[PDB]
Design a protein around this ligand. Structure first.
Ligand SMILES: COc1cc(Nc2nn([C@H]3COCC[C@@H]3C#N)cc2C(N)=O)ccc1Cl
Length: 294
């Protein structure tokens, strides 16, 4: 008789999502050769399955996606989006929990009435706690902006994208980047713009700019890009970044957001010391905000 293979152990992996049951609903966002879509994982095929956020490659940067997947899989913090699993074809898709409120960019313009200064400072503490957790794992985020901060509820935010996240080598203080063509220059510290060097303090600088967005309720007209382009001029093209570096070297910074008390603005200015070594830490920011909350 014919010889077949004995059926062995088949324990179902809860982190393995089958392609055939992962049904696309809509696009959520894009960023650095990746795209994020809302999908329903529907193995029963009746629209009752869980909604998930799915990151995949836009149709060679497969290595970058795999590295991002491995980082997120191992991060466990209240203010970091939850990894759910993967969908494997060499292809791979990252499956994450879906946060329907979106990012601070979508949420803040629509909920100004519900979100007061006290709530903004509580979101600022939560971003700092997620970032301090990331730093303790020796990672530099490199893309900290309000568009990457997801709203779990009126009371909770989570850092929701790790597309640019890099490990800082033990006993080294920074990561040197090579691919910088689509850098978020208006959120970047001078060392990132001048030498393409990324420190934990470079994320503190980016946090300061994110805090500025949070305080302005992510209004497009007072965005860090709109504000810096008004300061340096918007028709410089390829000369924009040197003009930005020059402006920062002169000591010019984003102005105090409307209705922001000076005490909060002073904590923000501490993120923006020209030299990385003079900048505040995430732990000291948490202390500062908590002092203002009680
Ligand atoms: C951008 O607008 C929306 C986004 C969401 N959700 C998400 N967005 N993202 C990323 C999408 O790409 C940009 C960066 C974002 C980050 N962080 C992840 C999620 C998610 N895990 O739920 C939900 C609703 C709306 Cl309207």
């Amino acid at each position: 008789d014919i010889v077949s293979e004995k059926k062995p152990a088949t324990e179902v992996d809860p982190t393995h999502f089958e392609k055939r049951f992962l049904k696309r609903i809509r696009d959520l966002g894009e960023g650095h050769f990746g795209k994020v879509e809302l999908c329903r994982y529907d193995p029963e095929g009746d629209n009752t399955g869980e909604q998930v956020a799915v990151k995949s490659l836009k149709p060679n940067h497969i290595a970058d996606l795999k590295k991002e997947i491995e980082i997120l899989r191992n991060l466990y913090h209240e203010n970091i989006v939850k990894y759910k699993g993967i969908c494997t074809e060499n292809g791979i898709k990252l499956i994450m929990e879906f946060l329907p409120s979106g990012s601070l960019k979508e949420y803040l313009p629509k909920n100004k009435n519900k979100i007061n200064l006290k709530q903004q400072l509580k979101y600022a503490v939560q971003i700092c706690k997620g970032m301090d957790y990331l730093g303790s794992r020796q990672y530099v985020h490199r893309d900290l902006a309000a568009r990457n901060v997801l709203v779990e509820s009126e009371h909770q935010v989570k850092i929701g994208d790790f597309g640019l996240t890099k490990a800082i080598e033990t006993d080294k203080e920074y990561y040197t980047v090579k691919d910088d063509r689509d850098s978020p220059v208006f959120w970047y510290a001078p060392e990132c713009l001048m030498q393409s060097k990324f420190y934990i303090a470079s994320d503190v600088w980016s946090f300061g700019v994110t805090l500025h967005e949070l305080l302005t309720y992510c209004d497009s007209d007072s965005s860090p890009m709109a504000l810096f382009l008004k300061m340096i001029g918007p028709t410089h093209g390829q000369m924009t970044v040197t003009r930005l570096v020059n402006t920062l070297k002169e000591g010019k910074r984003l102005p105090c957001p409307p209705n922001c008390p000076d005490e909060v603005y002073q904590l923000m200015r501490k993120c923006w010391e020209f030299q990385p070594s003079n900048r505040t830490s995430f732990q000291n920011l948490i202390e500062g905000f908590e002092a203002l909350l009680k």
